[model samples]
Target: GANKTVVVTTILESPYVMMKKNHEMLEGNERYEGYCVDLAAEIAKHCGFKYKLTIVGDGKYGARDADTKIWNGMVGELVYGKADIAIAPLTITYVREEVIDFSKPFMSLGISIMIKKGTPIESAEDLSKQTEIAYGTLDSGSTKEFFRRSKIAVFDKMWTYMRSAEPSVFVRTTAEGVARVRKSKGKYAYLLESTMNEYIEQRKPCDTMKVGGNLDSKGYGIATPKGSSLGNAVNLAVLKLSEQGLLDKLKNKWWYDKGECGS
Candidate 1:
């Protein structure tokens, strides 16, 4: 089985990978699918390697552990040798990048806010100064990283609440975080990516809006364990996908064209 396949670790985040709702009718790869699915095939083809797709067991993307000076989640897949590659929407962060090598961005995106309608929020500035209305990020993702290490003005303010807030303001996942806003009764806000925030707006019973603008511009890359031979090829493959317009196509497939946003 040595020459059979490289185990590529993935995740089941929406529009990235999920059961087809009729999964019993499909085959191995078909039973699991999303943006990362297409990304996996692209990376494999671009790297000229064969891979066996495997979903990551831990739901968190990547974050610091309480005790060990370790990073967990999909990045954990490669760090612990559980898998050879990770093509999920793993945000490129300073700490993670130091431990792993990520290919050039397959796409560039930024953090946005999902606030309930008629809420007393207008921008990151509004959320920063208020103690009554608590705003927090989806636990264990980019937005948290932005706050944890940001030098920006609002980030410094938001960090105060993020780092030391009562009732533990953060939510578990993006969906649940969005729901907190939709049903917030005007006291909570969910901070996440612009791409995801826009996606939620198009869904049924949409009650939230992506407020103001992005906090910062960042890109998600294909991360390989540091010094892995596949790093160069993987980076090249992402550039190739961008050239062939495949990356654009995938965005259209998952987040853009299918909705009312009028991309």
Candidate 2:
């Protein structure tokens, strides 16, 4: 048990886990880089464990199928024993907490709006009140689930429109949602995490913006199976990192230091 390598489940989302330019010539973890890649190294060092990073099989953050009652994505990997831990941009939510143990938040974030430049959308209320600009969330993640389960008047109204919109407003990936925003010429807005929305705003073309305040406050946490032995150490490591300001350092390193868009 002591020598067994911990398997970490993650996903490929830009500025988090991405393929390096020479990935085809590399093997194993060498093929990847970015914020999560760097964070994983720190986590393993602090926890004193040998770990392997494996991308989530389905590329989902994790979600429960209402009809099948089965979990998928990194959360499922932990639930089903497919992986020992999940280290990605996984949000901490009530339903997910029921089955998995989460470290104290490693990153704070919230649902935010991503609109192409000049979209004229300022807030969730604006998007909720208009039908001219189609909007949606990445399918099967917390953002979509937020709308699906919200009781607030604006969010409830948004869910009503999204669930029934023609041409299927839901996107299978964040990139797809971002692409829709760019290509729709201000006709599409993507509801996603503020962290990612901010990251993309600094990328090439610079045609998108994260508008308005976050819809709700939340944080992302590292996840392990319920009652995992690694949970305690990982939690302590996160708190240590936060206290030392390493978390902030990493955020600026990956999100700003290498940003392509000029200030």
Candidate 3:
């Protein structure tokens, strides 16, 4: 128990899991770093276990197949006994909670639209009505599924248009969606978590901007398989981190410190 090695599964998303610009000589966990890297270290220290971090094989957070009912991605790894914990930007959702457990929320966020800086798009309503500009979400991510199942008028309207768009609007990753936004020259908009939209807005080029209020409220949590003992310890650690302002500190470290966009 004291010396066990925990397998941690994560995904590479900006301001979450990033390769350090100067990490060439670093080894093991030191070779790469970001919010989750520091978080995993703190969690291990408090939980009393060594850990090995690995990226999700499918490069997805987690989702269930409608046809097969099989889980895939980080949730799949944990449900099938592949990883002991997931320490990344995984969102806490009702569907995901049915198969796994999530610690207290470490960060709050919601869906938002990312568009080229000068794009005329101001809201989901704007994007929904126009055929000239295309919009979509990461195909396997919670955000994409949310739109698919959402009954809310605006979301439903947007999803209808997206599903029928020629050449398909959906992308496989947030990076791809953002890249599309940057290269589409005001013709593309991407729907994603606001936390990422804000972080990327402050990065180099700064050609993208988050427009309008968040679509809904949600949070990110540290996930563990159901009935795992690590859940309690990780939850307590997150509370301590939040109480001590360490979460805020980490947010500043990654999102603001090297920001290229003017404050």
Candidate 4:
């Protein structure tokens, strides 16, 4: 069969994928730009397919929703058949991988902590055995779930704090949790990706810094429905981009480069 445009669902996130301020005038993939934009086009070229871009609803991306057992955003888009593939920067969590198949990680990151600096909490273990300092993460994303399913030593220690802490430490989103860090006056710590931590630290009123190493190890991967024939080709495309330095260039262009988010 000849190639057809596959609806590739994505979300508007800084440094990953975002709708251009003037997306309407752009042609084809130009309407979306950033790392995922480049990655998506490469995948289609290598896999011999065409694509149409759609923004995910709820903007939650890949996150844990136990009560509903549904992954929101593109997670919802892919599962409900709203889209054929997802090329956004989606995290590969155990809960999510069980629901949707992912290629090898396109990028690597670990669940790490951030604080406003000088809190005396050095590691997950310190918080694991303390009450003076409090920590939290976005309510339903991989970071929170990382603690939920943790079987390792660091995670086991951190898990204790996450579960039994009074008043609960979960925030609605990563931004909200980071805002709490600034407004918190050195009482709260935020758990999120190391990449995000570095991005936020360089921004205005910057008071946050990634403290301690990750409690676990995992990476982000390109996702598709469980048996998509395009999986191998797309996976190879990502590896090629990584090897050619395209992925790293994109990362610096978006994250380290200033003026995108006014950093």
Output the number of the TM-score-best candidate.
Answer: 2
Off by over 4 Å in 1: 24-27, 260-263
Query: How would the candidate models be sorted by TM-score, starting from the highest?
Result: 2, 3, 1, 4
Give candidate 4 regions above 4 Å deviation.
Answer: 19-31, 63-71, 164-167, 259-263
Q: Give model 1's TM-score versus the native structure.
A: 0.92
lDDT of 1 by residue, 1-263 (tens): 35557788887777877777878676667687788888898788767788877778887788778699676888887898888888888888888898889999987879988888778788899888777788888778778878988888878889977888877778888888887887778788888988788778866575788889788898889888989888988988899899999999998888766665343
Task: Provide TM-scores for the models.
Answer: 0.92, 0.98, 0.96, 0.85
lDDT of 3 by residue, 136-248 (tens): 88888789888999998989999898888888898988889999999999998999999999998998898999999999899999999999988999999999989999999
lDDT of each: 0.82, 0.94, 0.90, 0.78
Name the candidate that leads on lDDT.
2
Candidate with the larger lDDT of 1 and 4 = 1
162: Cα error in model 4, Å: 2.6
Report the C-alpha lDDT of model 4 over 87-137, residue by residue, as the tens digit: 876888776788788888888888777888777887887777777778888
Q: After superposition, how far is residue 114 of candidate 1 from its true place, in Å?
A: 0.7
Q: Clash pairs of candidate 1?
A: none
